[PDB]
Amino acid sequence: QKRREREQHIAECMAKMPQMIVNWQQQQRENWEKAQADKER
Amino acid sequence: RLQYLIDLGRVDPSQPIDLTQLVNGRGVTIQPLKRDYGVQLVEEGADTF
Amino acid sequence: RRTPPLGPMPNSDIDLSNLERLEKYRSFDRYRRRAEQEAQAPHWWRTYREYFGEKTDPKEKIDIGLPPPKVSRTQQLLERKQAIQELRANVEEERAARLRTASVPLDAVRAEWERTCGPYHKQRLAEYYGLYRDLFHGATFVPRVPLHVAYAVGEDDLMPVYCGNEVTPTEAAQAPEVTYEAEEGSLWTLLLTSLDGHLLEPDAEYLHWLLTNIPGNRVAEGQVTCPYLPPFPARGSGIHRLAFLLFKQDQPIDFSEDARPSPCYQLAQRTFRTFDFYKKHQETMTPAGLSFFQCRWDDSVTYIFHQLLDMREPVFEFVRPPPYHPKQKRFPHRQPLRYLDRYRDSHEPTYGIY
Amino acid sequence: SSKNLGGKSSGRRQGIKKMEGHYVHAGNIIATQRHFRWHPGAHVGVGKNKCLYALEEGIVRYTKEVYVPHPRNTEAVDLITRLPKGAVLYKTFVHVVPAKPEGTFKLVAML
Amino acid sequence: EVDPVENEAVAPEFTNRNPRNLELLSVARKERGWRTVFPSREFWHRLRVIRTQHHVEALVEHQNGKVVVSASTREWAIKKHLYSTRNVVACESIGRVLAQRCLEAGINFMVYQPTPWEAASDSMKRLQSAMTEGGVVLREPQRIYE
Amino acid sequence: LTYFSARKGKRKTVKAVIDRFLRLHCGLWVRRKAGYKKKLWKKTPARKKRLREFVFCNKTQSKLLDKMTTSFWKRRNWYVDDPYQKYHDRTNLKV
Amino acid sequence: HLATAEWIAEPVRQKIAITHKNKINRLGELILTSESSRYQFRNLADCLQKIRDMITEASQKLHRIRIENMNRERLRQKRI
Amino acid sequence: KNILVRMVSEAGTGFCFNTKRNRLREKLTLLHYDPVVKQRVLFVEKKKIRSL
RNA sequence: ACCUCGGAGCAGAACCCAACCUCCGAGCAGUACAUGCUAAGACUUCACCAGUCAAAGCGAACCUCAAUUGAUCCA
Ligand SMILES: [Mg+2]
Ligand SMILES: [Mg+2]
Ligand SMILES: [Mg+2]
Ligand SMILES: [Mg+2]
């Protein structure tokens, strides 16, 4: 039961994972956009 | 070792073999005070047994 | 303690007085060019070329070829330049060159490349592949006859053997069609030999075709002194060299000591040495064409070993030398259990007297 | 008094570990150096403390070769492009001449 | 006893004398090192381009320094069809001819080492594009160490 | 150490040695590297692996540990799934 | 002898032949070797496991060769 | 001025690693290789250990 | 007054080499987040401890710096 619960939790997180990949990446490029705006200032 | 004991006659194959028979044939030494729990049969010489 | 230099120093002829007034490398490309010529210079100190470069004898490798064709340089360059100004007077050529949309006819470029400068390049390729070291023991020739050879595959397909492309023995199983521009009354000899591929002798090669006394461009009426055996490189033995040699023959030559019998499927009889054969017949022909190719093992190769040659197919594999592993210490002071596993022989448990 | 402090560091034990003609196995460190005194040549790799080790197994040879730096090495290219014409730099390089072939083809079956 | 076939005498070690043998098996040594200097000499074959004031020239050359194949605007074969011998059209024509010549000779891989301005130059981009569509790969495969 | 005990008249074992070292029956002493669990944010990955290794000892250190341990720790032990059953013995060792 | 092995079905037998012709001798028999242990028991067990794996798969560098074959096609392109 | 921070994986594997970051910066989120799932996954910060 | 670490001279050219000898510094900072795993062969501050480089391989991609540091127990 413990092993199956751990594997199910890992599978759930990895299922949800690529959306957090892409939205963290767009957040990072938005940080780049804010940084280049601020150094344009 | 088992085949050697059988060929030299210290272990009788015509009767069931256990720890008393092996110890009486002096094929193994067992020290239960030194946490020995018996004899493990290992695979050396399986090709000629 | 000092020792004077054994020759001129490298940066010695540069005047160190007017070093602001001297001309300068402002270009990495200019420095790279000058450093490359200085690296190609001989030098009297120890050099990577001395320790790693290949050391040929200064024999000035003898030409065993045909004399070069003679051209008239003056009218040659006149025709060159007038073709050039005609093309430059073509207005659309300049427009295409400026718009970077021009092109070049590859087939015509190739064909008259073998017309003018293909022979010297072909000699350079075959020198790189090392036939003149192997086939001819150093002696060189410029192949002055374009020797087009192709293999009929399928019903509309054929395989050109150009100067070292890979041709599988499926494509090389039957006889290749050969052409080479020629005149009437001039005799020829065509030879196919496998250099790498001798299973027993490290020095000898195998004859595969010894067609002799060819009247001209027609190839099918000459004396077949040995039938065509398709190449047979063994499994895992690597990539082998097969060479077509074309010889200009002036007189007719008997080939009786070198006539392989009716179908000759013995490698001992098919043993061959281009050095010895051209040594025996040197005063008779002169090499004029050369085309070679590369081959690997195939199922057709398995077929020729089993059915034709009546052989159990040899199998070779490429094995690496055993690793170093220094002499084992009784106390491997700062090493791991991996050191003990390095010197272990068998991976299974052992029990000794028990 | 004696207001000078420090300077008590021991010697680094650097320098040549393998001279000319020494038989050297793969991965053996040839030289250890604080600056680029000897440069890597053929079959000699360089480690991030600028150490020199053998990439192949063989014989160590020290030669003297022309020096053409990488066009991204800015300070070296600056020295090159300020050098006078007709001059070339020379550096001492370390090579390993490999003694053994990579392997052999040998018969394993008679299929 | 069975009489052995006199053909079946095979040497227990094969001696392949092809200089391209271990190279095409990808077990031959590439000359590693020279990490401080330029260019890198860890290759088997190298494309080297020389753009002179009048001519564009290209070699395919072994590690030994032996020239395998060459192609130049110096040759009549190229001069008959270029408007000028120093254009990017010139370079593309040289690359197309050299690509078919390497196809022609059996050199399928080679290592091209341009300096940054050469690599950024349109002529060399057109050159490598012509080489790639001609059929040669400008990246050599890795050596099999084990 | 204690060469003759007060109760038995026997040599005693240094437990600090027992809790730090492992003696293979061939005669080798295995140990861990000092500070292999200290300041790993400072230590580089190659240095971390070097510290995670299990390393042997000198002849001098081995003789010293053999003197601090009694003969009970030098016996041959036939454990069930000992991961050092391979390393208890020497193979192909010439002098 | 692979061809006269009645305990193997016909199409999987042909699949075994065309898949492992590099282990078929000229007498038409399959050859399997094991040298992974110093016990002939384990070596024979490995050989039998190889036979079983071959039967079940029959029931069920490459880059270099591919690119050179593409170049051989591009040289092959010339018709009559 | 800097701080050592422990970052825990978002894959739920419990894997974690310590990095340094400036104290004045916000809460860190990185893409680091998780060896349990054999894949480069997100790690968010979860603790601050000591001051650097 | 100093006590630990590093660079230069003394110690000119493999290594090493002292003084309450002559000078200069260090007890970090910056980047990265595969700064992952594993593994031939070596170096070594004159011992040990500690320290250093690294082929190949798996998996990816297509670190600078000179010192910039602290063992065991225990928490
Ligand atoms: Mg000092
Ligand atoms: Mg000192
Ligand atoms: Mg030491
Ligand atoms: Mg590696």
UniProtKB/Swiss-Prot annotation, chain A:
Localization (cell): Mitochondrion; Nucleus
Tissue expression profile of the protein: Widely expressed. Highly expressed in the thyroid gland, heart, lymph nodes, trachea and adrenal tissues. Expressed at lower level in liver skeletal muscle, kidney, pancreas, testis, ovary and stomach. Barely detectable in adrenal adenoma and papillary thyroid cancer.
Top-level taxon of origin: Eukaryota
Complexes and interactors: Component of the mitochondrial large ribosomal subunit (mt-LSU). Mature mammalian 55S mitochondrial ribosomes consist of a small (28S) and a large (39S) subunit. The 28S small subunit contains a 12S ribosomal RNA (12S mt-rRNA) and 30 different proteins. The 39S large subunit contains a 16S rRNA (16S mt-rRNA), a copy of mitochondrial valine transfer RNA (mt-tRNA(Val)), which plays an integral structural role, and 52 different proteins. Interacts with GADD45A, GADD45B and GADD45G. Interacts with NR4A1 via the NR4A1 AB domain. Interacts with ATAD3A and ATAD3B. (Microbial infection) Interacts with the human papilloma virus type 16 (HPV 16) minor capsid protein L2.
Additional remarks: Cells overexpressing GADD45GIP1 were more likely to be in G1 and less likely to be in S phase and grow more slowly than control cells. Inhibiting the expression of GADD45GIP1 promotes cell cycle progression.
Protein family membership: Belongs to the mitochondrion-specific ribosomal protein mL64 family.
From Swiss-Prot, chain B:
Assembly notes: Component of the mitochondrial large ribosomal subunit (mt-LSU). Mature mammalian 55S mitochondrial ribosomes consist of a small (28S) and a large (39S) subunit. The 28S small subunit contains a 12S ribosomal RNA (12S mt-rRNA) and 30 different proteins. The 39S large subunit contains a 16S rRNA (16S mt-rRNA), a copy of mitochondrial valine transfer RNA (mt-tRNA(Val)), which plays an integral structural role, and 52 different proteins.
Organism lineage string: Eukaryota, Metazoa, Chordata, Craniata, Vertebrata
UniProt subcellular location: Mitochondrion
Top-rank lineage group of the source organism: Eukaryota
Name of protein: Large ribosomal subunit protein uL15m
Signal peptide: none
Coiled-coil portions: none
Family of this protein: Belongs to the universal ribosomal protein uL15 family.
Originating species: Homo sapiens
UniProtKB/Swiss-Prot annotation, chain C:
Keyword Ribonucleoprotein on entry: yes
Family of the protein in this entry: Belongs to the phosphatidylethanolamine-binding protein family. Mitochondrion-specific ribosomal protein mL38 subfamily.
Chief place of localization: mitochondrion
InterPro entries: PEBP, PEBP-like_sf, PEBP_euk
Protein's name in the database: Large ribosomal subunit protein mL38
Keyword line: Coiled coil, Mitochondrion, Ribonucleoprotein, Ribosomal protein, Transit peptide
Coiled-coil regions listed: 73-101
SUPFAM superfamilies hit by this protein: PEBP-like
GO biological process assignments: mitochondrial translation
Annotated localization: Mitochondrion
GO cellular component: cytosol; mitochondrial inner membrane; mitochondrial large ribosomal subunit; mitochondrion
Stored Pfam families: PBP (PF01161)
Record note on quaternary structure: Component of the mitochondrial large ribosomal subunit (mt-LSU). Mature mammalian 55S mitochondrial ribosomes consist of a small (28S) and a large (39S) subunit. The 28S small subunit contains a 12S ribosomal RNA (12S mt-rRNA) and 30 different proteins. The 39S large subunit contains a 16S rRNA (16S mt-rRNA), a copy of mitochondrial valine transfer RNA (mt-tRNA(Val)), which plays an integral structural role, and 52 different proteins. mL38 is located at the central protuberance.
UniProtKB/Swiss-Prot annotation, chain G:
Subcellular localization: Mitochondrion
Posttranslational modification: Methylation of glutamine in the GGQ triplet by HEMK1.
Tissue: Down-regulated during the in vitro differentiation of HT29-D4 colon carcinoma cells.
Protein role: Essential peptidyl-tRNA hydrolase component of the mitochondrial large ribosomal subunit. Acts as a codon-independent translation release factor that has lost all stop codon specificity and directs the termination of translation in mitochondrion, possibly in case of abortive elongation. Involved in the hydrolysis of peptidyl-tRNAs that have been prematurely terminated and thus in the recycling of stalled mitochondrial ribosomes.
Subunit structure of this chain's protein: Component of the mitochondrial large ribosomal subunit (mt-LSU). Mature mammalian 55S mitochondrial ribosomes consist of a small (28S) and a large (39S) subunit. The 28S small subunit contains a 12S ribosomal RNA (12S mt-rRNA) and 30 different proteins. The 39S large subunit contains a 16S rRNA (16S mt-rRNA), a copy of mitochondrial valine transfer RNA (mt-tRNA(Val)), which plays an integral structural role, and 52 different proteins.
Family of the protein in this entry: Belongs to the prokaryotic/mitochondrial release factor family. Mitochondrion-specific ribosomal protein mL62 subfamily.
Annotated protein name in UniProt: Large ribosomal subunit protein mL62
Species for this entry: Homo sapiens
Taxonomic lineage from the root: Eukaryota, Metazoa, Chordata, Craniata, Vertebrata
Gene label: MRPL58
